[PDB]
Design an enzyme around this catalytic site. Structure first.
Site, short mmCIF file in Angstrom:
data_model
loop_
_atom_site.label_atom_id
_atom_site.label_comp_id
_atom_site.label_asym_id
_atom_site.label_seq_id
_atom_site.Cartn_x
_atom_site.Cartn_y
_atom_site.Cartn_z
N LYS A 17 0.90 -1.05 0.08
CA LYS A 17 0.09 -0.19 0.02
C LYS A 17 1.14 1.25 0.02
N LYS A 36 13.16 -0.58 1.27
CA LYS A 36 12.01 -0.24 1.14
C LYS A 36 11.52 1.28 1.14
CE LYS A 36 7.59 -1.10 4.17
NZ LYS A 36 7.16 -1.93 5.15
N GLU A 85 16.83 -6.75 5.73
CA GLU A 85 17.31 -7.83 5.22
C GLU A 85 16.51 -8.71 4.08
OE1 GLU A 85 16.79 -11.13 8.16
OE2 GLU A 85 17.28 -12.82 7.04
N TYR A 86 17.53 -9.14 3.10
CA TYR A 86 16.84 -9.58 1.83
C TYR A 86 16.42 -11.06 1.97
CZ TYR A 86 17.47 -11.65 -2.86
OH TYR A 86 17.31 -12.50 -4.01
N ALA A 87 15.22 -11.37 1.61
CA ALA A 87 14.77 -12.73 1.65
C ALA A 87 14.76 -13.25 0.09
CB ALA A 87 13.53 -12.84 2.17
N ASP A 130 -0.78 -8.36 12.03
CA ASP A 130 -0.90 -8.33 10.49
C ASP A 130 -0.31 -9.61 9.88
OD1 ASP A 130 -2.10 -7.35 8.15
OD2 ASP A 130 -0.08 -6.03 7.67
N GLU A 134 1.33 -12.52 2.55
CA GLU A 134 2.22 -11.48 1.90
C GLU A 134 3.32 -11.00 2.90
OE1 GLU A 134 -2.03 -9.57 1.33
OE2 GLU A 134 -1.53 -11.73 2.07
N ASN A 135 3.18 -11.09 4.05
CA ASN A 135 4.11 -10.67 5.26
C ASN A 135 5.00 -11.66 5.59
OD1 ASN A 135 3.15 -8.01 4.67
ND2 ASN A 135 1.67 -8.21 6.36
N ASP A 148 7.11 -6.78 7.97
CA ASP A 148 6.21 -6.02 7.83
C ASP A 148 5.39 -5.70 9.44
OD1 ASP A 148 4.23 -3.94 7.29
OD2 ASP A 148 3.33 -5.26 5.66
N1 LIG Z 1 13.17 -8.24 2.62
C1 LIG Z 1 12.48 -8.56 1.45
N2 LIG Z 1 12.93 -9.50 0.55
C2 LIG Z 1 12.33 -9.64 -0.63
N3 LIG Z 1 10.99 -9.25 -0.82
C3 LIG Z 1 10.43 -8.26 0.07
C4 LIG Z 1 11.07 -8.00 1.07
N4 LIG Z 1 10.29 -7.00 1.84
C5 LIG Z 1 9.31 -7.02 1.20
N5 LIG Z 1 9.35 -7.62 0.17
C6 LIG Z 1 8.29 -7.75 -0.91
O1 LIG Z 1 7.52 -6.40 -1.17
C7 LIG Z 1 6.13 -6.56 -0.59
C8 LIG Z 1 5.70 -5.58 0.42
O2 LIG Z 1 6.49 -5.32 1.55
P1 LIG Z 1 5.87 -4.74 2.82
O3 LIG Z 1 7.22 -4.49 3.76
O4 LIG Z 1 4.95 -5.87 3.13
O5 LIG Z 1 5.38 -3.46 2.32
P2 LIG Z 1 3.90 -2.80 3.11
O6 LIG Z 1 4.47 -2.41 4.63
O7 LIG Z 1 3.59 -1.60 2.38
O8 LIG Z 1 2.97 -3.95 2.83
C9 LIG Z 1 6.08 -7.76 0.17
O9 LIG Z 1 4.78 -8.32 -0.10
C10 LIG Z 1 7.18 -8.66 -0.45
O10 LIG Z 1 6.61 -9.47 -1.64
MG LIG Z 2 3.15 -1.87 6.32
MG LIG Z 3 2.89 -5.95 3.61
#
Ligand SMILES: Nc1ncnc2c1ncn2[C@@H]1O[C@H](COP(=O)(O)OP(=O)(O)O)[C@@H](O)[C@H]1O
Ligand SMILES: [Mg+2]
Ligand SMILES: [Mg+2]
Ligand SMILES: Nc1snnc1-c1ccc(C(F)(F)F)cc1
Ligand SMILES: [Cl-]
Ligand SMILES: [Cl-]
Length: 265
Positions: A17, A36, A85-87, A130, A134-135, A148
């Site tokens: 979002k 991010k 951290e990169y996943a 939350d 997705e998180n 997240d």
């Molecule tokens: N550390 C990470 N490594 C790989 N992909 C990520 C990472 N962080 C976020 N993502 C991707 O970006 C999307 C949004 O990240 P997120 O922090 O959940 O954003 P928001 O807080 O706006 O929901 C996640 O659903 C994931 O697909």
């Molecule tokens: Mg968020």
């Molecule tokens: Mg999220």
């Protein structure tokens, strides 16, 4: 300290979002990370500055193998940057769309890892609120990592911010705007276990209004292929009264979990 000039930006990893996440490499160390990016303008408009600070503060002090690290942050005239951290193996969401549904061993292992991470969080009275596919991200060995922490708080609590998207993972007390505590994460744990095995969350519906109704009344049924052990665990977690939901130790020591998980507590 850190600035944008310190990093080389790579491919888009995902979008939220507010969050726009990119692969990145720090120039001097060649360290690979996830950046991010948030826009100050939309953050001000939504009035969620307090959510971002809580995300930075809570996540940066936590240290657990099943929780995503936050190394730092920086900001300019228009954007805010979180250094994560990169996943490498992506989200549980994406993995679920690939396979349609997980088997009992895959599901049980994920639940154990979640319960371990949540147990660590609750020991500091930190509640995530939350938890959804997705998180949940995956490490290089396929291990689960919670991310997240934008909605996380300290218990007990009320809700001061507008509920944005889906209601699918929230308990009755949060949706009805009542006061809540740690037991909200355990309701979510029950929702995930169902969706992992079935392919869709238990209270899913076509409209906001109807999903609301099924959640407050706890209306869900099992497909025939869901076994007795899974039904027992899920039924215990999806209780309307939060004080009747099990402790995380009970989840980790549940006979179905212990028989099917491939990781310990
Ligand atoms: N550390 C990470 N490594 C790989 N992909 C990520 C990472 N962080 C976020 N993502 C991707 O970006 C999307 C949004 O990240 P997120 O922090 O959940 O954003 P928001 O807080 O706006 O929901 C996640 O659903 C994931 O697909
Ligand atoms: Mg968020
Ligand atoms: Mg999220
Ligand atoms: N400067 C503005 S404007 N809107 N949000 C911000 C903001 C939000 C969070 C932080 C952080 F320190 F926690 F990282 C800094 C700034
Ligand atoms: Cl950018
Ligand atoms: Cl049965």
């Amino acid at each position: 300290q850190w600035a944008l000039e310190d990093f080389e930006i790579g491919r888009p990893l995902g979008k939220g979002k507010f969050g726009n996440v990119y692969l990145a490499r720090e120039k001097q160390s060649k360290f690979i990370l996830a950046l991010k990016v948030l826009f100050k303008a939309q953050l001000e408009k939504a009035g969620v500055e307090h959510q971002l600070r809580r995300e930075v503060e809570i996540q940066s002090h936590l240290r657990h193998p099943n929780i995503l690290r936050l190394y730092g942050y920086f900001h300019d005239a228009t954007r805010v940057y979180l250094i994560l951290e990169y996943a490498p193996l992506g989200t549980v969401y994406r993995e679920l769309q690939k396979l349609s549904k997980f088997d009992e061993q895959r599901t049980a292992t994920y639940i154990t890892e979640l319960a371990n991470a949540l147990s660590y969080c609750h020991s500091k009275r930190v509640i995530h609120r939350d938890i959804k596919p997705e998180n949940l991200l995956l490490g290089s060995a396929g291990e689960l990592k919670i991310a997240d922490f934008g909605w996380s708080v300290h218990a007990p609590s009320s809700r001061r911010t507008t509920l944005a998207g889906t209601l699918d993972y929230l308990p009755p007390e949060m949706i009805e705007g009542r006061m809540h505590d740690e037991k909200v994460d355990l309701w979510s744990l029950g929702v995930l276990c169902y969706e992992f095995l079935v392919g869709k969350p238990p209270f899913e519906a076509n409209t906001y209004q109807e999903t609301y109704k099924r959640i407050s009344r706890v209306e869900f049924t099992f497909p025939d292929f869901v076994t007795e052990g899974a039904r027992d665990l899920i039924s215990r977690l999806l209780k309307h009264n939060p004080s009747q939901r099990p402790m995380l130790r009970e989840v980790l020591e549940h006979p179905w979990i212990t028989a099917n998980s491939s990781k310990p507590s």
